[PDB]
Amino acid sequence: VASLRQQVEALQGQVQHLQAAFSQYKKVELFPNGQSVGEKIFKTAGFVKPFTEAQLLCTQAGGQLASPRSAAENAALQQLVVAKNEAAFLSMTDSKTEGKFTYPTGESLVYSNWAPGEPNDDGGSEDCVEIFTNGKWNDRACGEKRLVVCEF
Amino acid sequence: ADIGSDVASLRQQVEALQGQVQHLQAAFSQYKKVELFPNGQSVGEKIFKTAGFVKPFTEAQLLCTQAGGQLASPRSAAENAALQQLVVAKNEAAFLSMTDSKTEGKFTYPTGESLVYSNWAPGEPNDDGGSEDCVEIFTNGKWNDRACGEKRLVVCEF
Amino acid sequence: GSDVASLRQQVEALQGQVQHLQAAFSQYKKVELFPNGQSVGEKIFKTAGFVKPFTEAQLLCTQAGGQLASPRSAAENAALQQLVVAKNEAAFLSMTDSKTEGKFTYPTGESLVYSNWAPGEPNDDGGSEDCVEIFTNGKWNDRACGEKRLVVCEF
Numbered sequence A: 001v002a003s004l005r006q007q008v009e010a011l012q013g014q015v016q017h018l019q020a021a022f023s024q025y026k027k028v029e030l031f032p033n034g035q036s037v038g039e040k041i042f043k044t045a046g047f048v049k050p051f052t053e054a055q056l057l058c059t060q061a062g063g064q065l066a067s068p069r070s071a072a073e074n075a076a077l078q079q080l081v082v083a084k085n086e087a088a089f090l091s092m093t094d095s096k097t098e099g100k101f102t103y104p105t106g107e108s109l110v111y112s113n114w115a116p117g118e119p120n121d122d123g124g125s126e127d128c129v130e131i132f133t134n135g136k137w138n139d140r141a142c143g144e145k146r147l148v149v150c151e152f
Numbered sequence B: 001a002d003i004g005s006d007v008a009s010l011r012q013q014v015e016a017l018q019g020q021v022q023h024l025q026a027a028f029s030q031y032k033k034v035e036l037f038p039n040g041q042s043v044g045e046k047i048f049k050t051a052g053f054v055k056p057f058t059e060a061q062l063l064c065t066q067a068g069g070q071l072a073s074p075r076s077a078a079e080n081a082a083l084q085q086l087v088v089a090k091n092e093a094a095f096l097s098m099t100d101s102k103t104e105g106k107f108t109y110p111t112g113e114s115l116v117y118s119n120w121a122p123g124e125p126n127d128d129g130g131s132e133d134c135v136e137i138f139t140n141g142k143w144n145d146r147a148c149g150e151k152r153l154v155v156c157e158f
Numbered sequence C: 001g002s003d004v005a006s007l008r009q010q011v012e013a014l015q016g017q018v019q020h021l022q023a024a025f026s027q028y029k030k031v032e033l034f035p036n037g038q039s040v041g042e043k044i045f046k047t048a049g050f051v052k053p054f055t056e057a058q059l060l061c062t063q064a065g066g067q068l069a070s071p072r073s074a075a076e077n078a079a080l081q082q083l084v085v086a087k088n089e090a091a092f093l094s095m096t097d098s099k100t101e102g103k104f105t106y107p108t109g110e111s112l113v114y115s116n117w118a119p120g121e122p123n124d125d126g127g128s129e130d131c132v133e134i135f136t137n138g139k140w141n142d143r144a145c146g147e148k149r150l151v152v153c154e155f
């Protein structure tokens, strides 16, 4: 029992160092292309791509396209869009049923920040969503190229 | 019921936990190297990281502060050399955190404390044009006071 | 008796913190790799995003604590190919035949244990191609070390 008690104390020291070092590296990592909000992390690839390609990049990376579910998350996302000065794609679309936007899971939206008059399915062909530098949303053609931002 | 068995069970758990920590330590060390390549430099307990682009002092300062750090503030020859590596790699002079905006001729850190280290280029600081309150570090590592409105490489320290 | 019990709850608590750290670390690891890195096995490839001549690229990787990309299998080669395709730029590998023409080796001097030469390669075209580049199609080509190619290191 003496040895065990001694080992445990040793582990505490190792863990304290890791937590401290990790805390520092998290800040370093997020600068300047990431944003942490709650338990979510948004990170931009810094370039533009059409929706399908953007979606694949995020999913293959173990995440998904930016999916702001609250005003706080939307503002965090807006910071990256503003930094790059490029509107970005969100993960949501109404490709399945026109007029009904859903997350990749199929769940209906729990938050939205549509610009006045949007979504309007302009030209009868806008199933994707973009977020502007002002944080507002607009449905847009999925074939258009927008800033790639994933969430993890 | 058997104290010996209870101790053995705890031993088993401690061994497993110890394994987890050893694995994490090795994985974290590798990740640190990956993170620092190619825009970061670690010196002592400080880490310098560049954003890869230029901005005027005010915007550069806000970027670093909002990221939870501050503009590069080399406090020794060792830290200066580390920062210089990034400046050289990007071939772009960078802003430091220090200014003499409060009292002309007296440079201080964001906290207000006076410099504990300096590496001024010959003849600097010279407050050229009577309007240079910020500081830039050249690819040769030397410092020069510069107009804060000018754009220089953004490098933060964490 | 009571000691083992107190040590128990102490271990239980510490394990909780480690697993929380493990969870946070796993998340930041994914974030780190997006979009300039690729993990394969215990190896991690990461591109600097810019091109450089061989010597300069090699120094960058070594000074960073790693080495130039050195795919030792089809799986590692495929992972590396992803970064090349994503950046749409051929990249230098670590291997060269600078010591003995026609014989490519890793920085340690060991002979290749895997290769993926494109048709007709290596051909030492021009009479001086001692470095190696990987194309977007994953195939290899010996290239003049003085040429500039995408910098990709492995850690």
Ligand SMILES: OC[C@H](O)[C@H]1O[C@H](O[C@H]2[C@H](O)[C@@H]([C@@H](O)CO)OC(O)[C@H]2O)[C@@H](O)[C@@H](O)[C@@H]1O
Pocket (backbone or CB within 6 Å): B124, B126, B128, B132, B144, B145, B146, B147
């Ligand atoms: O007196 C003029 C000389 O030609 C002087 O010019 C250079 O020095 C510059 C100095 O580098 C800059 C910077 O300090 C601006 O941030 O300000 C100036 O304009 C001069 O003071 C250099 O050639 C000196 O050797 C020379 O003395």
Ligand SMILES: OC[C@H](O)[C@H]1O[C@H](O[C@H]2[C@H](O)[C@@H]([C@@H](O)CO)O[C@H](O)[C@H]2O)[C@@H](O)[C@@H](O)[C@@H]1O
Pocket (backbone or CB within 6 Å): A117, A118, A120, A122, A126, A138, A139, A140
């Ligand atoms: O076109 C009629 C009005 O001028 C209308 O124009 C703007 O609205 C446009 C939308 O922004 C746009 C967007 O939804 C595409 O993804 O589709 C359109 O072409 C218009 O609906 C704006 O000035 C409106 O205020 C105005 O009503």
Ligand SMILES: OC[C@H](O)[C@H]1O[C@H](O)[C@@H](O)[C@@H](O)[C@@H]1O
Pocket (backbone or CB within 6 Å): C120, C121, C123, C125, C129, C141, C142, C143
């Ligand atoms: O580095 C030079 C290249 O190997 C080039 O050499 C020759 O010109 C041919 O074999 C080409 O098909 C090949 O692509």
Ligand SMILES: [Ca+2]
Pocket (backbone or CB within 6 Å): A094, A095, A098, A124, A125, A126, A127
């Ligand atoms: Ca539709």
Ligand SMILES: [Ca+2]
Pocket (backbone or CB within 6 Å): A094, A098, A099, A121, A125, A126, A127, A128, A139
């Ligand atoms: Ca639609």
Ligand SMILES: [Ca+2]
Pocket (backbone or CB within 6 Å): A118, A119, A120, A121, A122, A126, A138, A139, A140
């Ligand atoms: Ca619209």
Ligand SMILES: [Ca+2]
Pocket (backbone or CB within 6 Å): B100, B101, B104, B130, B131, B132, B133
């Ligand atoms: Ca002044």
Ligand SMILES: [Ca+2]
Pocket (backbone or CB within 6 Å): B100, B104, B105, B127, B131, B132, B133, B134, B145
């Ligand atoms: Ca001044």
Ligand SMILES: [Ca+2]
Pocket (backbone or CB within 6 Å): B124, B125, B126, B127, B128, B132, B144, B145, B146
């Ligand atoms: Ca000056």
Ligand SMILES: [Ca+2]
Pocket (backbone or CB within 6 Å): C097, C098, C101, C127, C128, C129, C130
């Ligand atoms: Ca040769």
Ligand SMILES: [Ca+2]
Pocket (backbone or CB within 6 Å): C097, C101, C102, C124, C128, C129, C130, C131, C142
């Ligand atoms: Ca050759």
Ligand SMILES: [Ca+2]
Pocket (backbone or CB within 6 Å): C121, C122, C123, C124, C125, C129, C141, C142, C143
């Ligand atoms: Ca060739």
